[PDB]
Amino acid sequence: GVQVETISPGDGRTFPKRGQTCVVHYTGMLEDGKKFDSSRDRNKPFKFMLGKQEVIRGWEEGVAQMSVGQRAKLTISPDYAYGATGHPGIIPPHATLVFDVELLKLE
Numbered sequence: 439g440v441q442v443e444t445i446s447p448g449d450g451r452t453f454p455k456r457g458q459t460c461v462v463h464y465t466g467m468l469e470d471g472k473k474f475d476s477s478r479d480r481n482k483p484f485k486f487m488l489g490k491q492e493v494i495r496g497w498e499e500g501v502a503q504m505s506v507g508q509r510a511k512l513t514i515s516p517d518y519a520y521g522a523t524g525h526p527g528i529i530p531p532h533a534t535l536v537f538d539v540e541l542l543k544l545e
């Protein structure tokens with residue numbers, strides 16, 4: 439599943455609901471700490487609509503437990519990310535992913 443650990447608290451009241459657009463900044467890493475993706479490097483926030491499955495299951499379930507303004511570390515198992523096949527060339531098979539995610543606002 440996905441484990442959510444707080445890095446900096448959000449408002450503790452406003453939680454994402456299915457259908458809303460989450461605007462986040464994130465950095466993805468492999469178990470070892472190797473960065474594979476980061477909206478922060480592109481200095482452009484990433485947006486996705488909750489419930490539309492346009493992101494991995496771990497994001498759908500983990501970001502829904504975060505509140506606006508919160509920054510958390512999500513540790514995601516293979517079955518909630520890219521599974522056995524992974525994404526050859528970027529993500530290994532059966533990879534446990536770690537994401538540093540900050541929820542900036544909801545639209």
Ligand SMILES: [N+]
Binds near residue numbers: 520521524525
């Ligand atoms: N995959």
